[PDB]
């Protein structure tokens, strides 16, 4: 199984490399060659979830058989027996093993600095270039630093 | 199964490449060569959902057999027994494995900037060029940036 773990590491590294390639394909025309640096971290879960759900519909029952005895005298006896049929959904789901659980991307732009408007524009391009998903916990940093 | 995961990555990359090709086929005449850059992120779910639904119709029962005893004297006894037949739908669905769960497209247009009207027109063309589906969570960014 350790060979499987090794190949999982290979998958994660391949994903990171592909994302880096896309980042380059976007930023190389916009910024130029050597005016930026970017690295990508991709964390992938490899669990084996397998779920079975059996759901009913309480608010729409359908009476199948029914008995109702109601006699008076004073005495009032109200017996009743009822059998129901209910909407039944049975869903069996099997999640894919390797899923990107969190994605971190950081891009540093060489100074000569960059204005806030262009930094936010680059961030907007990257959002969509990488597939930024904040609800997944992903993080995207864009900074303007001084290259040596 | 890790080979299957590798081929799933290949499928996702192929989808992204096809969408990029369509984007180019639309924008190359309109904008020109080298006046734009665009990248596409496609996230695909590969679950194995398999659902079985059994639904009834509570509001239209059909009486199959019926017994009704109603005697008086004062004393009033009202016995009743009833059997019903109901509309029964049984649907077994099996979803396709790989489905595009979210799609992100970002396009950056070289300045010399672009007016808001033409930016929105390009966005309208892309909506339909790519098959934008906001209800799916898809995202489409169109920006006017300064190429270096």
């Amino acid at each position: 199984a350790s060979a499987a773990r090794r190949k999982e590491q290979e998958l994660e590294r391949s994903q990171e490399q592909a994302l880096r390639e896309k980042i380059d394909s976007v930023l190389l025309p916009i910024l130029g060659y050597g005016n930026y640096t970017a690295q990508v971290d991709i964390q992938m879960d490899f669990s084996a979830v397998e779920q079975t759900r059996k759901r009913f519909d309480p608010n729409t029952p359908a009476t199948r058989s029914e008995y109702a005895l109601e006699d008076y005298n004073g005495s009032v006896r109200k017996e009743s027996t009822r059998n129901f049929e209910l909407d039944t959904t049975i869903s069996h789901e099997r999640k894919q093993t390797g899923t990107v659980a969190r994605q971190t991307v950081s891009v540093a732009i060489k100074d000569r600095p960059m204005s806030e408007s262009e930094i936010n524009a680059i961030r907007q391009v990257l959002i969509g270039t990488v597939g930024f998903d904040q609800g997944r916990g992903d993080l995207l940093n864009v900074l303007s630093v001084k290259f040596a | 199964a890790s080979a299957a995961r590798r081929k799933e990555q290949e499928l996702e990359r192929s989808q992204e490449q096809a969408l990029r090709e369509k984007i180019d086929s639309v924008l190359l005449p309109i904008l020109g060569y080298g006046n734009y850059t665009a990248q596409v992120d496609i996230q695909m779910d590969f679950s194995a959902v398999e659902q079985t639904r059994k639904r009834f119709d509570p509001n239209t029962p059909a009486t199959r057999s019926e017994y009704a005893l109603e005697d008086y004297n004062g004393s009033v006894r009202k016995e009743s027994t009833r059997n019903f037949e109901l509309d029964t739908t049984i649907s077994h669905e099996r979803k396709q494995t790989g489905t595009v769960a979210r799609q992100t497209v970002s396009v950056a247009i070289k300045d010399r900037p672009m007016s808001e009207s033409e930016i929105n027109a390009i966005r309208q063309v892309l909506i339909g060029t790519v098959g934008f589906d906001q209800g799916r969570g898809d995202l489409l960014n169109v920006l006017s940036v300064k190429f270096a």
């Binding site: 058989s65 008995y67 027996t81 059998n83 | 027994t81 059997n83």
Partner: peptide, 12 residues
């Protein structure tokens, strides 16, 4: 009565 119900108990 119809014990048809997979959980029919009323029976009677």
């Amino acid at each position: 009565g119809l014990s048809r119900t997979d959980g029919r108990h009323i029976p009677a």
